[model samples]
Target: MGRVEVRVEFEGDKMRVRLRNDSSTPVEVHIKVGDEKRTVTVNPGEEVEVTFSANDPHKFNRPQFTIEWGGQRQHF
Candidate 1:
């Protein structure tokens, strides 16, 4: 199994994050952007996308992503 891949896109006041699961099993992903937080489950070889409002994108804290799979957890 492998790790998850993360991608982020910015469009004016909106932000989009995509998580791709490359592992052999399902993964639980936690995403936090500014004050908004979301959790989603991604199946192997599948992708999940999330969108958030980013009014002051440059002034806010960096986004956080974490993945849990096969009894292991990692932060990105």
Candidate 2:
């Protein structure tokens, strides 16, 4: 199984993501806001936090998340 989960914290007009994992490997996390995608860095067995200021907060509907680790992407 993969080792990453996403947690969202709403801050008015910004979106903060807490990527939590419990593994011993490096992971590249990809996230998308509408068609614009971005990525974050997550360490093994740690909670990696990222904050994004939105051009349009409503654009942040159901975000697409893909974490590339262990030769696969764990999507949310």
Candidate 3:
């Protein structure tokens, strides 16, 4: 089984998405900021961070997230 935690931060014109895996397996994360979408895999006990351009900071304050692990999926 695997567990993943998601964190989002806005810095100037960039949006940072961070993923931390806390379980024994790998986890997949899907992120969508307006029309820009990205997918990343995080290994157990590992943390991953990705940055995206926030053309309109206010409009993309909160991005969409989908996490997959241990054959289970969660959306936020």
Candidate 4:
């Protein structure tokens, strides 16, 4: 999706996700890493970033997450 994109980066021992929304409507983004779930709301033509750390106790053995979003509601 060109209008929307999800970018992932590994920095040291942490994971960073960059969400981009280039439409005229806002979108909702949900990300889950290990057992922690985070949500982000992106406005039109905006970008947001969320970070997750993989430390001792909070070790993120796996490095994957699910992201979903919904744009403006349409009546058709």
Instruction: Arrange candidates by lDDT, descending.
Output: 3, 1, 2, 4
- Give the per-residue lDDT of model 3 (tens digit) for 1-76: 5567888888888988888999987788888888899888788899999888955777576689887776543332
Tell me the whole-model lDDT of each prediction, alpha carbons only: 0.80, 0.76, 0.80, 0.70
Candidate 3 segments whose C-alpha is farther than 4 A from its true place: 71-76
Highest TM-score among the candidates is held by which one?
Answer: 3
Q: What TM-score, computed on C-alpha atoms, does each candidate reach?
A: 0.79, 0.73, 0.81, 0.71
Against the true structure, candidate 2 has what lDDT?
0.76
lDDT of 1 at 44: 88
Cα displacement (angstroms), candidate 3, residue 25, comes to: 0.9
The ten-residue window of minimal lDDT in model 2 covers 67-76
Q: Clash number for model 1?
A: 0
Pairs that clash in candidate 2 = none
- TM-score between model 4 and native: 0.71
- In candidate 1 the C-alpha lDDT for residue 54 amounts to 64
lDDT of 2 by residue, 11-67 (tens): 878888888877677688887877677776677778888777777779777877877
lDDT tens per residue, model 4, 1-76: 3377888887787888898888666677777777777777777788899988766535555655444445443210
